[PDB]
Amino acid sequence: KVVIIGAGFAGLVAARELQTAGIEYEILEAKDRIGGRAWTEERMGRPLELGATWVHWFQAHTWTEIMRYGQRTEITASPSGNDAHWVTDGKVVKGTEDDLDEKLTAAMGVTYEGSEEYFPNPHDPLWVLSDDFDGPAEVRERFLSDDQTNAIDLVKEAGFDQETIDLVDAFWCAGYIGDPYTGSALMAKQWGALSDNRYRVMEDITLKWKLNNGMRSLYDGIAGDLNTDIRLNTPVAKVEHHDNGATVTTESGEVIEASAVICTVPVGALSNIEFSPALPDAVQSVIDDKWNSQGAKIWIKIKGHHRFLGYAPKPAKMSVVRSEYFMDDDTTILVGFGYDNTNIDLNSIEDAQAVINQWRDDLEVVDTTGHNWVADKWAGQAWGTLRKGQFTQGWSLFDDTDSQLFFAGSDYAYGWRGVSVDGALEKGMTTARQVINSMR
Numbered sequence: 093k094v095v096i097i098g099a100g101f102a103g104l105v106a107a108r109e110l111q112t113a114g115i116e117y118e119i120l121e122a123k124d125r126i127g128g129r130a131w132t133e134e135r136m137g138r139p140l141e142l143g144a145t146w147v148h149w150f151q152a153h154t155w156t157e158i159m160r161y162g163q164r165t166e167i168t169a170s171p172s173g174n175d176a177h178w179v180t181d182g183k184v185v186k187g188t189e190d191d192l193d194e195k196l197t198a199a200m201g202v203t204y205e206g207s208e209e210y211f212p213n214p215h216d217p218l219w220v221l222s223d224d225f226d227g228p229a230e231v232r233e234r235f236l237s238d239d240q241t242n243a244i245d246l247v248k249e250a251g252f253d254q255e256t257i258d259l260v261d262a263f264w265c266a267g268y269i270g271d272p273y274t275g276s277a278l279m280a281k282q283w284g285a286l287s288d289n290r291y292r293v294m295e296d297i298t299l300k301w302k303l304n305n306g307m308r309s310l311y312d313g314i315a316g317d318l319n320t321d322i323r324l325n326t327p328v329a330k331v332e333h334h335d336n337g338a339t340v341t342t343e344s345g346e347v348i349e350a351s352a353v354i355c356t357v358p359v360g361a362l363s364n365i366e367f368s369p370a371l372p373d374a375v376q377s378v379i380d381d382k383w384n385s386q387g388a389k390i391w392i393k394i395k396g397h398h399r400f401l402g403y404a405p406k407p408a409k410m411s412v413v414r415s416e417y418f419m420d421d422d423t424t425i426l427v428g429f430g431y432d433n434t435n436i437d438l439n440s441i442e443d444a445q446a447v448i449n450q451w452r453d454d455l456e457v458v459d460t461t462g463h464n465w466v467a468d469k470w471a472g473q474a475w476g477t478l479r480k481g482q483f484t485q486g487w488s489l490f491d492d493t494d495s496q497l498f499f500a501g502s503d504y505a506y507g508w509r510g511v512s513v514d515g516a517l518e519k520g521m522t523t524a525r526q527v528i529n530s531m532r
């Protein structure tokens with residue numbers, strides 16, 4: 093009787109949790125596929141992750157699923173020791189990957205500042221604003237101020253030179269997958285807290301280990317455990333929600349009565365659903381503003397075998413580009429992240445060549461691909477990232493729902509929020525527990 097909207101990782105893991113508890117459920121998915129913003133598909137001659145790629149054993153929820161579904165040894169590190177190139181004052185500088193990582197590491201020290209005072213338990217991000225907070229008032233003041241400051245201004249104010257500013261600009265265009273200047277620095281500080289406050293750990297967690305058999309090995313694994321068939325091609329159009337239950341109406345007009353609704357539709361796509369009663373004003377403000385998630389991910393194929401890393405600041409088409417696969421026909425597939433989905437066509441060879449031309453004039457693009465999640469009606473965003481003010485008055489507001497409508501998804505997680513499948517698996521599971529505990 094529990095209706096789960098969406099067959100991404102949050103909805104799939106919530107269904108499995110309800111199944112463990114003996115609670116009847118149904119998953120309604122708009123697309124003709126499961127996985128959501130995780131999507132492994134053959135393109136350009138090999139399986140490519142069009143969304144979600146990297147994992148780590150320090151991500152508890154993701155790692156448990158890797159172990160459950162047989163993928164313990166089926167991980168491979170992305171290429172390292174690349175020849176690095178970065179754009180700073182309109183010019184290309186060359187160096188080793190170590191040289192670049194050394195500059196980023198120094199900048200991260202200032203970027204993380206305060207994380208040890210804010211996040212002693214990095215899974216209690218709002219402890220500073222709780223009644224259990226016992227530190228000095230200046231820590232709470234700085235915490236609130238940091239929600240209104242972007243991560244680049246922290247580096248500027250610390251006196252780093254233009255080269256380092258341009259490097260962190262590029263870095264956070266990728267990390268905020270959007271304009272980093274509108275973002276909340278508290279997001280970066282919590283990533284530090286979850287990464288033992290070390291840049292190398294943060295990159296090991298978010299940008300190193302890939303699944304040989306893809307995210308699909310995990311999402312197909314969860315779906316394979318479910319005893320109730322997923323209803324594909326069944327978009328939800330309306331959710332009526334009250335203290336005792338809910339009523340869901342699909343696009344086709346079908347009415348489904350529910351004891352509770354677990355809604356995993358991300359903010360970028362919530363406007364497709366009519367909520368009755370209307371969602372609270374503070375939650376609607378977040379939906380209207382969005383998340384800071386307007387960027388895009390590309391896969392580019394070039395001739396030859398090239399160990400390449402490139403960084404470029406806003407407003408570049410792509411801000412971080414790295415070699416990922418060396419193919420058997422003397423080509424290299426590279427991944428790229430850019431701040432602005434509308435400034436690049438992910439499937440245009442000319443735009444992909446323009447990306448590579450940001451750093452070199454001697455590399456030739458032969459193929460390119462990607463899926464523009466921001467222009468996907470059922471997503472409307474890449475991974476969720478925080479605008480100024482959204483660390484303290486954003487993601488946590490979706491819990492302030494008195495009715496039997498529950499919001500679950502990576503974007504509302506306490507831990508690796510938005511950026512990681514770990515957050516979807518966390519919040520899908522704990523939202524199922526909210527439903528279970530209420531019924532018990």
Ligand SMILES: Cc1cc2nc3c(=O)[nH]c(=O)nc-3n(C[C@H](O)[C@H](O)[C@H](O)COP(=O)(O)OP(=O)(O)OC[C@H]3O[C@@H](n4cnc5c(N)ncnc54)[C@H](O)[C@@H]3O)c2cc1C
Nearest residue numbers: 098100102122128129144145146328474475501502512513
């Ligand atoms: C480009 C990109 C790269 C990423 N890389 C990584 C990475 O390297 N590592 C990592 O850990 N994470 C990564 N992620 C993040 C990861 O993909 C997400 O955190 C996670 O997949 C989100 O899961 P979810 O279940 O919360 O939401 P979703 O996956 O968005 O699931 C929501 C589901 O609801 C469906 N839906 C939407 N509207 C409706 C409707 N009206 N009715 C019915 N169904 C509907 C959608 O089709 C979708 O299937 C990346 C994300 C992106 C966008």
